[PDB]
Amino acid sequence: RPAPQTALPPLEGLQADNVQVPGLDPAAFKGKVSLVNVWASWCVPCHDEAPLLTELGKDKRFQLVGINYKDAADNARRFLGRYGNPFGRVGVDANGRASIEWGVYGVPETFVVGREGTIVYKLVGPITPDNLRSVLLPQMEKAL
């Protein structure tokens, strides 16, 4: 299905290369292979998976998008300062309403969005070394 057309404001004060990281504009999916991760600082598996996303963010073939779910800004900024920020865009979903449009049961969940802006794969639960290497990255490469 087409990715939901949800627009979300940014996480104020999150910077990359000395400029504010933008929020989520659904036009950003077209033409790219994107990973969309829905996370919160209070979520236990979200901590477990964070260092794996920081590494994946080094791979410039892909766009990484974060949806910060039901999380206070100070805590979200602490989280990304602790583990690093792998995301090129971070949208804040303070009330969870955008995540319902994405079909999110709880955090974390991860989606792969292809060049046509459609959802080609979903992972429920944390990214692990095994599902990164042998499930998610293969699907992402196929979508290129």
> How many CB atoms neighbour CB 104 within 10 A?
19
Residues in the chain: 144
Residues forming a β-bridge with 69: 93
> How many CB atoms neighbour CB 110 within 10 A?
22
Find out if CATH 3.40.50.2300 is the number for domain 1-144: no
Secondary structure class of 132 (helix, strand, coil): helix
| Domain range annotation of the chain | 1-144
Report the C-alpha gap between 76 and 68 in whole angstroms.
Answer: 7
Question: How far, in whole angstroms, is CA 129 from its chain's centroid?
Answer: 17
Question: Do strands 19-20 and 89-93 pair parallel, antiparallel, or not at all (unpaired)?
Answer: unpaired
Residues forming a β-bridge with 29: none
By what technique were these coordinates determined?
X-ray
Residues forming a β-bridge with 110: 37, 123
Secondary structure class of 37 (helix, strand, coil): strand
Question: Do strands 15-16 and 63-69 pair parallel, antiparallel, or not at all (unpaired)?
Answer: unpaired
Distances (CA, A) of 78 to 14, 23, 45, 54, 74: 10, 18, 16, 15, 6
Q: What element of type H or E holds 81?
A: helix 73-83
